[PDB]
Design a protein around this ligand. Sequence first.
Ligand SMILES: Nc1nc2c(ncn2[C@H]2C[C@H](O)[C@@H](COP(=O)(O)NP(=O)(O)OP(=O)(O)O)O2)c(=O)[nH]1
Ligand SMILES: [Mg+2]
Ligand SMILES: [Mg+2]
Ligand SMILES: [Mg+2]
Length: 329
Amino acid sequence: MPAYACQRPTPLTHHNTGLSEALEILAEAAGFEGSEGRLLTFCRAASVLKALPSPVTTLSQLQGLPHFGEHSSRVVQELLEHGVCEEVERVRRSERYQTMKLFTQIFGVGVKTADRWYREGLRTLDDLREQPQKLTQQQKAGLQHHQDLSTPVLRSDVDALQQVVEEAVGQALPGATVTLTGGFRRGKLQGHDVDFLITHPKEGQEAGLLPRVMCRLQDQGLILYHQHQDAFERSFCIFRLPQPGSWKAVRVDLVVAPVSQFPFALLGWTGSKLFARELRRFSRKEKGLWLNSHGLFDPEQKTFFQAASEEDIFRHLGLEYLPPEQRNA
DNA sequence: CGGCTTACG
DNA sequence: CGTA
DNA sequence: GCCG
Ligand SMILES: Nc1nc2c(ncn2[C@H]2C[C@H](O)[C@@H](COP(=O)(O)NP(=O)(O)OP(=O)(O)O)O2)c(=O)[nH]1
Ligand SMILES: [Mg+2]
Ligand SMILES: [Mg+2]
Ligand SMILES: [Mg+2]
């Protein structure tokens, strides 16, 4: 079992679901307290279990596994012996964890903002609604749409959304393409949003595209919120999506990349977020190359690797290729 | 011990 | 600060 | 919290 998540296949569904879910609670709680190192270790340990070929049934099976030390092994031991880990349960029911989870789930609210509100005594969404002077326009939109945004997006929703985005993209720039990325590209059957990557086969033609796309979507009445309701290339918006007799708000992410960068953007925005983070860490620490969603840089030669495909990038990094369905770290 | 992310909005 |  |  290699130490980096990008060195092993991680399928969407696996054989250690309960154990990984417990470790991810602790990871989440570490992030609520600002402990990014502990968050990473618990995230990485959970990911190791997702990559295992069978269930962990005894402690000895944790021997030699990367990112399992005293703390994560004790968590697994208690789940194996009693079905529950007291630390995890204490976190689950704590007022701090529940409120930080509630607040950070709001679109436009991160850990710093949620922590400030918590310290001021706020605890519920209605607490926030009563203090609208505390809220950015983005957070007001996240708060008003919170109930719809907490409803999982379904794979059936995704196809209708992609068609309306493609229609607006095609008017904005004939020949531009829309590629589904994020969790649905990794095979997820539901998600918190829908992620699209847009490009054009003629390098440079994608410049200035996303303002034109957003203006067309907004004119069609499909945009409930976006940051530009000047030049921009990413939009994190809220879409109006049809439903039986009505509609629901859905988060949609749109990203534009030139075709030269498209493989790097596709790799970055397909995720998972831990997979991509580990891939960039592997690139820097093990290969001495700087990877991001725009390219792959050799700091010694001061040169960028050209890539025509994700397969190119895995090869540049000396990694076996993983299809998106195996990037569910 | 140092290290653990990234550009863009 | 937020996207996260 | 764990790795190197
Ligand atoms: N660097 C970084 N990139 C991130 C982060 N979160 C997301 N991204 C970028 C990089 C990710 O690869 C990309 C897509 O992640 P989502 O759409 O946020 N989530 P997914 O589709 O996996 O699932 P679902 O939507 O169902 O929750 O967004 C983060 O914390 N950090
Ligand atoms: Mg997504
Ligand atoms: Mg997204
Ligand atoms: Mg230390």
